Design an enzyme around this catalytic site. Structure first.
Site, mmCIF file in Angstrom:
data_model
loop_
_atom_site.group_PDB
_atom_site.id
_atom_site.type_symbol
_atom_site.label_atom_id
_atom_site.label_comp_id
_atom_site.label_asym_id
_atom_site.label_seq_id
_atom_site.Cartn_x
_atom_site.Cartn_y
_atom_site.Cartn_z
ATOM 1 N N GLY A 63 13.999 45.408 71.845
ATOM 2 C CA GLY A 63 12.864 46.013 71.175
ATOM 3 C C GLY A 63 11.992 45.028 71.082
ATOM 4 O O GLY A 63 10.243 46.219 71.039
ATOM 5 N N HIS A 123 10.591 54.613 79.061
ATOM 6 C CA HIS A 123 12.144 54.519 78.127
ATOM 7 C C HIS A 123 11.918 54.871 76.656
ATOM 8 O O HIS A 123 12.585 54.737 76.452
ATOM 9 C CB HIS A 123 12.836 53.542 79.675
ATOM 10 C CG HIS A 123 12.538 51.986 78.564
ATOM 11 N ND1 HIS A 123 11.995 50.815 78.904
ATOM 12 C CD2 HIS A 123 12.998 51.626 77.847
ATOM 13 C CE1 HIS A 123 12.275 49.546 78.369
ATOM 14 N NE2 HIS A 123 12.948 49.938 77.241
ATOM 15 N N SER A 136 10.707 45.765 74.010
ATOM 16 C CA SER A 136 10.252 47.099 75.065
ATOM 17 C C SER A 136 9.000 47.687 74.984
ATOM 18 O O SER A 136 8.882 48.149 74.128
ATOM 19 C CB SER A 136 10.877 47.193 75.431
ATOM 20 O OG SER A 136 12.927 46.471 75.771
ATOM 21 N N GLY A 137 7.512 47.682 75.956
ATOM 22 C CA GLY A 137 6.994 47.948 76.566
ATOM 23 C C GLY A 137 5.538 47.342 75.926
ATOM 24 O O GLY A 137 4.398 47.194 76.005
ATOM 25 N N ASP A 184 8.062 52.018 84.732
ATOM 26 C CA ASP A 184 8.713 52.377 83.684
ATOM 27 C C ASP A 184 7.214 51.830 82.642
ATOM 28 O O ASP A 184 7.175 51.499 82.427
ATOM 29 C CB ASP A 184 9.307 51.305 83.199
ATOM 30 C CG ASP A 184 10.294 50.978 82.128
ATOM 31 O OD1 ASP A 184 9.572 52.379 81.423
ATOM 32 O OD2 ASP A 184 10.789 50.050 81.873
HETATM 33 C C1 RPR Z 1 21.033 42.382 74.911
HETATM 34 O O1 RPR Z 1 20.434 42.589 75.931
HETATM 35 C C2 RPR Z 1 18.930 43.503 76.587
HETATM 36 O O2 RPR Z 1 18.522 43.874 75.377
HETATM 37 C C3 RPR Z 1 18.945 44.549 77.635
HETATM 38 C C4 RPR Z 1 17.660 45.280 77.567
HETATM 39 C C5 RPR Z 1 16.312 44.612 77.845
HETATM 40 C C6 RPR Z 1 15.213 44.685 77.603
HETATM 41 C C7 RPR Z 1 14.015 43.865 77.261
HETATM 42 C C8 RPR Z 1 14.041 42.959 77.989
HETATM 43 C C9 RPR Z 1 15.086 42.320 78.369
HETATM 44 C C10 RPR Z 1 14.933 40.798 78.980
HETATM 45 N N1 RPR Z 1 16.242 40.563 79.173
HETATM 46 N N2 RPR Z 1 14.084 40.762 79.578
HETATM 47 C C11 RPR Z 1 16.719 43.429 77.984
HETATM 48 C C12 RPR Z 1 20.146 45.369 78.302
HETATM 49 C C13 RPR Z 1 19.981 46.631 76.929
HETATM 50 N N3 RPR Z 1 20.668 46.517 78.823
HETATM 51 C C14 RPR Z 1 20.760 45.535 80.438
HETATM 52 O O3 RPR Z 1 21.650 44.531 80.329
HETATM 53 C C15 RPR Z 1 20.161 46.200 81.455
HETATM 54 C C16 RPR Z 1 19.259 46.552 81.709
HETATM 55 C C17 RPR Z 1 18.851 47.348 82.555
HETATM 56 C C18 RPR Z 1 19.507 47.850 83.855
HETATM 57 C C19 RPR Z 1 19.540 48.123 85.153
HETATM 58 C C20 RPR Z 1 18.356 48.287 85.515
HETATM 59 C C21 RPR Z 1 18.360 48.696 86.954
HETATM 60 C C22 RPR Z 1 19.079 49.432 87.753
HETATM 61 C C23 RPR Z 1 20.655 49.277 87.491
HETATM 62 C C24 RPR Z 1 20.773 50.096 87.905
HETATM 63 N N4 RPR Z 1 21.688 51.463 87.027
HETATM 64 C C25 RPR Z 1 20.558 49.245 86.451
HETATM 65 C C26 RPR Z 1 20.932 46.457 83.346
HETATM 66 C C27 RPR Z 1 21.355 46.171 82.799
#
Ligand code: RPR
Ligand code: CA
Length: 223
Positions: free
Chosen positions: A175, A40, A177-178, A84
């Protein structure tokens, strides 16, 4: 990284920053010409930045190399985030040294309880946004699959694992991520997702790299 600490310059030599005029994702160097990141994080126009600590200042030890191709896993699903993982081939091989080095792929999967190091330049706040200049680090354990599936019912596939703290306060975040999850000197995970960041009973979810080692090897061998 929420609730982590400053790593120290070049103490995580396999950490990569993916840049398109700003930092948008991390990655891991696995040999002199290949980087592993999350699918992603894909976009065109990726410059890989190696040997970084402060991503906003040229301090010395940086190597900036264009990506010549990015290979998203053919079965990646953006709705479920299953598979992913992405490989990036560098246009030129990196110069490996003490500050730029590759990390090993696992020979076997890690057990629940295994302590790992997660790192990145992502958000340091669970409530608002605050991006660091220097690389942050976090030590976190792999959680059991039953606790992971209890936290995220119906969303965890066999290509995912949870790591972190159910009490909240310490997690990776957007941020990051990856980027790498290294346990016992081996790359066992890739930062993928989570519900928010550092929330109680919502740990981080990571791509399980041990399920992909023969795909990585066969793909690099044919490219
Ligand atoms: C502020 O919040 C963030 O940054 C996170 C992303 C994010 C990025 C990297 C690490 C982490 C972490 N918590 N370890 C989190 C935010 C932007 N994202 C989410 O809420 C989030 C992300 C994925 C799903 C999700 C996953 C699989 C299936 C489905 C069903 N369709 C939903 C649900 C919610
Ligand atoms: Ca720099």
């Amino acid at each position: 990284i929420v609730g982590g600490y400053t790593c120290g310059a070049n103490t995580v030599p396999y950490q990569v920053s993916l840049n398109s005029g700003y930092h948008f994702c991390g990655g891991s160097l696995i040999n002199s010409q290949w980087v592993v990141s999350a699918a992603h994080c894909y976009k065109s126009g990726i410059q890989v930045r190696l040997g970084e600590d402060n991503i906003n200042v040229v301090e010395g030890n940086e190597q900036f190399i264009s990506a010549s191709k990015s290979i998203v896993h053919p079965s990646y699903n953006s709705n479920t985030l299953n598979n992913d993982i992405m490989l990036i081939k560098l246009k030129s091989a990196a110069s490996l040294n003490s500050r730029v080095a590759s990390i090993s792929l696992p020979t076997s999967c890690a057990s629940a309880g295994t302590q790992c190091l997660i790192s990145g330049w992502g958000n340091t706040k669970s409530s608002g946004t605050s991006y660091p200049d220097v690389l942050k680090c976090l030590k976190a354990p792999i959680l059991s699959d039953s606790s992971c599936k209890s936290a995220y019912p119906g969303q965890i596939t066999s290509n995912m694992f949870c790591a972190g703290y159910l009490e909240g306060g310490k997690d990776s975040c957007q941020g990051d991520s990856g980027g790498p999850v290294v346990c016992s000197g081996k790359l066992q995970g890739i930062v993928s997702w989570g519900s928010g960041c550092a929330q109680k009973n919502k740990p981080g979810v990571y791509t399980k790299v041990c399920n992909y080692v023969s795909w990585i090897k066969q793909t690099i061998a044919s490219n």
